A paper describes a structure:
pmcThe enzyme 2′-deoxynucleoside 5′-phosphate N-hydrolase 1 ([name]) (EC 3.2.2.-) is responsible for catabolizing toxic 5-hydroxymethyl-2′-deoxyuridine 5′-monophosphate (5hmdUMP), a noncanonical 2′-deoxynucleotide that, if incorporated into DNA, must be excised via DNA repair pathways. [name] catalyzes the hydrolysis of the N-ribosidic bond of 2′-deoxynucleoside 5′-monophosphates to produce 2-deoxyribose 5-phosphate and the corresponding nucleobase.5HsDNPH1 also accepts canonical 2′-deoxynucleoside 5′-monophosphates as substrates, albeit with very low reaction rates. The dimeric form is common for [name] and is essential for catalysis. The overall fold is similar to previously reported inhibitor-bound structures of HsDNPH1 and rat [name],6−8 with a five-stranded parallel β-sheet core surrounded by five α-helices.
To investigate the structural basis for catalysis of N-ribosidic bond cleavage, the structures of unbound HsDNPH1Trunc and dUMP-bound complex were solved with data to 1.7 and 1.42 Å resolution, respectively. Unliganded HsDNPH1Trunc and dUMP complex structures have four and two molecules in the asymmetric unit, comprising two dimers and one dimer, respectively. Buried surface areas were calculated by PISA24 analysis to be 1241.0 and 1267.5 Å2 for unbound and substrate-bound dimers, respectively. Binding of dUMP stabilizes the Ile29–Glu34 loop, for which no electron density can be seen in the absence of the substrate, probably as a result of high flexibility. Overlay of the unliganded and Michaelis complex structures yielded a small root-mean-square deviation of 0.52 Å over 117 Cα atoms. An intriguing feature of the HsDNPH1Trunc crystal structures is the presence of an apparent low-barrier hydrogen bond (LBHB) between the −COO– and −OH groups of the highly conserved residues Glu104 and Tyr24 as inferred from the O–O distances in unbound HsDNPH1Trunc and HsDNPH1Trunc:dUMP complexes, respectively. The distance between the O atoms of the Glu104 −COO– and Tyr24 −OH groups is 2.3 Å in the unbound and 2.4 Å in the dUMP-bound enzyme. As the Glu residue in the equivalent position to Glu104 is proposed to act as a nucleophile in the rat [name],10 the apparent LBHB might be involved in tuning the position and nucleophilicity of Glu104 in HsDNPH1. The small increase in the apparent LBHB length in the Michaelis complex as compared with the unliganded enzyme, still insufficient to disrupt the apparent LBHB, might reflect the poor substrate nature of the dUMP (kcat/KM of 27 M–1 s–1).
Residue numbers in the entry:
A (entry chain D): 20 to 28, 37 to 54, 72 to 160
B (entry chain A): 18 to 28, 35 to 57, 68 to 159
Write the structure that this text describes.
């Protein structure tokens, strides 16, 4: 199956459960960091929920870009948060996509991305 | 005849000036003089080119930040020497991904309090 890597700072469970429809979902501190980097390299698609500021999510996205991974960033503008210029500026509408969404439609959006 | 190129990033204003002022003792500080998606792309392109040209990356990682995290991820993938500075007094818990990236050599994470930041930078660069 496609191997899907998910990164997030109840909606996370929603996202992972729907991701499982479309592939195999991947996800002391050192072995974690090494394990996640092995999974990141094995992934066909990297999915990140980028609404909450997170050093960790950002680091995973940086490593994923350097591995030339396909990346889907999910951002909720109704949160009132300002998405990092570095993430919004990294978007290429192809290998790096930033999709704005409302909580209720997250499944329907994931279906559209992976059914296309 | 180039000095070492130092890239500073961080999400505090007095602290950032102290850090940048001290880094100027050790090299060129690339980001010293840093609204819409078009400008966001310029920021990203500019920062990524300065990151790739840097010798040392210094990041203040106390405030959670997608952008700082992303710069660190690109810096590791560029094989840059990295110093992360974290203030535990903030009450924040540093991301395990960052703490786990440390290897005590080319990627170091130092816990510090504000009064000693110049002395710590002296220790790293001397």
């Amino acid at each position: 199956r496609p191997a899907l890597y998910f990164c997030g700072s109840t909606l996370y469970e929603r996202i992972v459960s729907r991701l499982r429809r479309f592939g195999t979902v991947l996800t002391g501190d050192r072995l974690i960091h090494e394990q996640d980097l092995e999974w990141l390299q094995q992934a066909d698609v990297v999915v990140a929920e980028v609404t909450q500021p997170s050093l960790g999510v950002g680091y995973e996205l940086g490593r994923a870009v350097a591995f030339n991974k396909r990346i889907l960033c999910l951002f909720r503008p109704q949160s009132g948060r300002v998405l990092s210029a570095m993430i919004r500026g990294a978007a290429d509408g192809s290998r790096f996509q930033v999709w704005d969404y409302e909580e209720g439609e997250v499944e329907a959006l994931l279906d559209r991305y992976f059914e296309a």
